[PDB]
Each structure stands twice: as C-alpha cells, then as structure tokens.
C-alpha cells in the first residue's frame, strides 16, 4: 500500500554517480528500490539511461543488492 520508492527527479545518463539531487520518493507501482535506500545509492551507478519520473529498480543499478 503506501510503500514509497526511489523515482528519478531528472534524467539520470548512464554511468553516472547518483547524488541527492538526482532522486526523490513517490508512493508508485510497482514498487522499486525503497525510498529509505537512498543514502545507500549515493555514489552508485546506473548501468542505463534512467528519464525523468522512473521508478529505479534493483536492477538498474550497479553493485546494487538489499
């Protein structure tokens, strides 16, 4: 239900290091990476272009495992 997860806030390019500004938390579905992960992601990659308003999943991220 009200389970937020981490959506682009701008257009992430791929192979960049994610920071702050790059992501925010919405209530979407389905559900993505959770919202309280993004400390963790700062500094990871994303292995593809992420546009503006997509909900980050596990998968699109480098080195990522919960």
Do not use: F, H, K, W
């Amino acid at each position: 239900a009200n389970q937020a997860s981490v959506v682009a806030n701008q257009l992430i390019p791929i192979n960049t290091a994610l920071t702050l500004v790059m992501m925010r938390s919405e209530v979407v579905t389905p559900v993505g990476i959770p919202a309280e992960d993004i400390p963790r992601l700062v500094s990871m990659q994303v292995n593809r272009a992420v546009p503006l308003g997509t909900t980050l999943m596990p998968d699109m991220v480098r080195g990522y495992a919960a």
